[PDB]
């Protein structure tokens, strides 16, 4: 019997300063955070309707650089789906993506972990990572790619909702 | 791909005067209709959330008292079979509604809920136990309702949606 | 703001008083006619109470349970308690004292958010008068609400009132 | 041009103790008030959907007996529709209804004022006003009658929603 | 009396590849479809509140080039309002608009059919159709013009809600 | 006791043509108004959820250039103010200090909930630098948000941020 809404555990990962927090806060509060306040670990909750199903999103916002690596392994084990975020004006953040992905696959001992590749800050004019390169990378992993802006809200709901759909597909 | 909410086609049947319209209008408008205006055929819609899933209920309210009857039985996915707990004849009619539905749909396992309406009234002629035994014999849920007090109204419709979902 | 406020509610009272039926009416808008004894079950629902969005975590307990350290442990997680009796069952009403003492013991406090709930008000076999229950609640400084899980009278109100009691305490 | 939801100013009137406040608080908070705390004047707001239209209910809960009569005139002038409440166990409250209706018509200087007759406390066993008598009275005025219980919530939404429907009919005249 | 929400039958028309599907999917799923999968015929539904009225939108997503022309006439007869979509980087799609409009008017035997002119892909830098020219075209038909991006979601709700308002004006 | 949702009286001020109406209509109707129809006075309402609290927003849309007793009246009744300039209109930005001083004078307070709004951020012809606006907002101790009534960038955020500023002030 139904005891309450389905819950999804989402984890947002990626390099320092790519906009992990800004994406999450835009989703939760409809607020753009202009300041750069480095994260240690924050967790958020939101109830949404996706494809006609009520969902409770539990979202873990992670540090760009995680010092205690056992803590990183713990959230990778518990997370059901991952947003892997880079910034489209930060080539290094893009090159870091494969490390996040490998870490997740290693910890979960699986090649098929729900994930979405997110190219954030698409509102900025100084793009250094081409859409084509990101799409090719996502295709090589068999995952969706979405361009986002925490500032304009382009793609924000879509990135989170797409990840829930990937989790749902994986469980079906 | 998701093209919009799930739709459920529900049909409310039973003898004249048992409260089919009053149940439906209570669900849709939160209004109790005190007058008895016999129905020909009316259809209503409401979006609800049941067990975390959004769905569009299409509800067909039928006349108590035949090609038109067959047509709505064919299109219906689930049926509320309503009698009034102060009307023994309406209860005895339930067997006929059930057989008609099974015949038309060519199925033994058609989502249905047995509804004993007007449970607010003191002059009960149909025992709860008798209705429960009948529902058990059909393998369907039984619910007592009052379109006047709203007791069991949402439950009757939501239960029927749950029966459709089980069947699908 | 990291998301809605959560409230941990625990439903206690004697065997058969309608703790599960009240909870399932809240969650599913369904009346359960069958009596399936509970050990421990948990439910969740988001509601709006006094303009504030709340996530309710509801723990539905066993009415017949000997001393358990494990019982004490889950009860200690509760922020507020519905203490339920049935208005046709005098012994369930007399057992309310025991539930109240248990809650005070486990929470190690005299001031625990609670609501007294007199369930099955639809039945003709009332043995506990409204005034007696109101007097008991007044003696504890808590609200009394009469409910019927069958008609749904007072169901939302019992849970929402408990949330208001928790908010007052915080 | 849409500037936000339509607002309806609803006023709840009737004799002392008939359950005006209990009805309103049941609507607003889903809470039954067992205590009898006599009202002076309180205002409540709730957004609801009625017949597919979103609207803001501004509800003025009044005193049974209003001492300052200019204050009474003021809310009757501003009110767009009125719930006239009696209690089904209180014959005097029912006999008062005609006078509340006449007071409203006098203040508004109109014969066609949106109103609903509400017979409250229908959960109680010692009924002194028969349903038929209330229905006959409502029919004589051309208005809806609804039986309510602020305790069980029977008819509560219906009473308020029906009044909004009466206001809409009057406005669409 | 009231038997449940008002239903509006909306039809999305225009040249191949202008973003008819992408607009509809953005509205329904808050998802941007990056791939180009040519449509035959798809129908979608959504309940929304527009100007305080609860509406059930039935949206018919059409093919750019309709081969069976009796099928085209049938959906034009049943549709209550039309989004006529072009892409602001595709001059040909803009020059085609008058053909779609004439088809609709011919089938409905009316000069007063609820319609909105939609200039889609306004996120792209390679604009070939000037806003002023589109506004002038809309003005010549007596209909609203809205610039949209199925990608950023700019104007998407507005285009559909504006069409519902046009239908309501025609019904009253 | 709870009598229904909390109401917030918001007032939108700023020079003629900066997009006060367009911002408000975007919020209320999800509609971008392309035409320039000068405002006299309009009031709008919307119920929203902000940080888990249901709020009724009462929004007063004002004339760029005002009868000054009428101006004083809405400034007295307003609980919070969006002070709007257009990022392509230097003069509208220079006017901001006058609106702020008027509000502080009328409300006889140095601590009035306000948000500085740089509107039309979709346009390419920017004449007011973000740094200058941020410095000005910081000098007043208020939030700064860039908006576009056209793209809807920042629109909800401007109004919701102002409600959060009012809530902070009311404790
Ligand atoms: N223009 C623009 N700036 C953005 C966007 N997302 C984030 N930023 C900015 O980039 C900076 C870093 O954002 P932040 O969310 O803190 O990054 P983070 O990835 O959470 N960092 P950390 O790993 O240290 O926790 C902030 O100044 C923020 O305003 C975006 O989409 N567009
Ligand atoms: N007391 C009470 N009266 C009820 C209840 N349900 C319906 N009624 C009353 O019974 C009468 C008939 O109800 P109605 O809805 O019209 O019945 P129906 O089954 O739709 N009739 P038909 O088959 O002619 O369309 C009315 O006077 C109505 O108010 C109920 O639960 N309790
Ligand atoms: N008439 C009526 N029966 C009720 C009501 N609430 C519960 N019941 C019935 O009482 C029986 C026991 O209810 P239930 O919810 O299982 O009780 P419980 O308090 O959860 N029992 P346990 O402690 O063993 O888990 C069931 O048959 C149920 O239908 C009520 O308000 N009215
Ligand atoms: N049983 C029952 N009691 C009710 C009902 N409505 C109100 N009461 C009770 O009757 C008493 C008076 O109710 P209240 O709402 O204060 O009445 P009022 O009309 O607002 N009084 P006043 O005119 O002084 O403000 C309270 O004790 C209340 O609990 C009802 O439907 N059922
Ligand atoms: N950048 C951008 N691309 C868009 C936009 N809308 C659509 N596209 C892209 O344009 C292509 C065609 O879009 P699609 O929705 O299939 O077009 P259509 O009008 O439905 N095609 P058809 O008539 O064949 O069914 C896809 O690659 C899609 O991603 C938009 O607003 N911006
Ligand atoms: N590109 C763009 N144009 C905008 C934006 N906001 C407003 N405009 C345009 O600017 C013009 C003036 O907008 P309007 O809302 O009337 O300004 P106002 O500040 O309310 N004027 P007034 O003080 O006379 O009432 C209109 O043509 C409108 O479309 C925006 O964010 N971007
Ligand atoms: Mg961070
Ligand atoms: Mg009928
Ligand atoms: Mg139990
Ligand atoms: Mg009162
Ligand atoms: Mg297509
Ligand atoms: Mg203006």
Author numbering:
A (entry chain C), E (entry chain F): -3 to 168
B (entry chain D): -3 to 61, 65 to 167
C (entry chain A): -2 to 167
D (entry chain B): -3 to 169
F (entry chain E): -3 to 62, 64 to 168
Article passage:
The RAS family of oncogenic proteins is important as therapy targets because of the frequency of activating mutations in almost all major cancers. All family members function by signal transduction to the nucleus of cells via interaction with effectors (such as RAF, RALGDS, and PI3K) that catalyze phosphorylation of downstream proteins. When KRAS is bound to GDP, the protein is in the inactive state and becomes activated by nucleotide exchange from GDP to GTP. Mutant RAS proteins remain in the active state and hydrolyze GTP at a much slower rate than wild-type (WT) RAS.
Initially, we wanted to establish crystallization conditions to obtain a crystal form that would allow free movement of RAS-binding compounds through the lattice for crystal soaking. All six crystallographically independent chains (identified as chains A–F) have the same fold. Noncrystallographic symmetry averaging of the electron density maps allowed the assignment of all of the polypeptide backbone for switch I (in all six chains). Switch II is more flexible in this crystal form and a complete model could only be built in three or four copies of RAS per asymmetric unit. Further evidence for the flexibility of switch II is that chain A adopted a different conformation in this region owing to interactions with a symmetry-related molecule. The solvent channels are also much larger, facilitating compound diffusion; consequently, bound compounds have more freedom to be accommodated within KRAS169Q61H crystals, and the structures are more likely to represent the interaction in solution. In addition, six independent protein chains are available for binding of compounds within the asymmetric unit, making this crystal form particularly suitable for compound-soaking experiments. When the crystal packings of KRAS169Q61H and KRAS188G12D mutant proteins are compared, the switch regions are more solvent-accessible and less sterically hindered for the Q61H crystal. A further comparison was carried out between the switch regions of the two full-length KRAS structures (G12V and G12D) with our new KRAS169Q61H structure (amino acids 1–169). Both KRAS169Q61H and KRAS188G12V lack stabilization in the switch II region, and this instability could be attributed to the lack of a Mg ion binding to the switch II. All of the comparisons and observations between different crystal forms and mutants led us to conclude that the KRAS169Q61H crystals were the best option for crystal-soaking experiments.
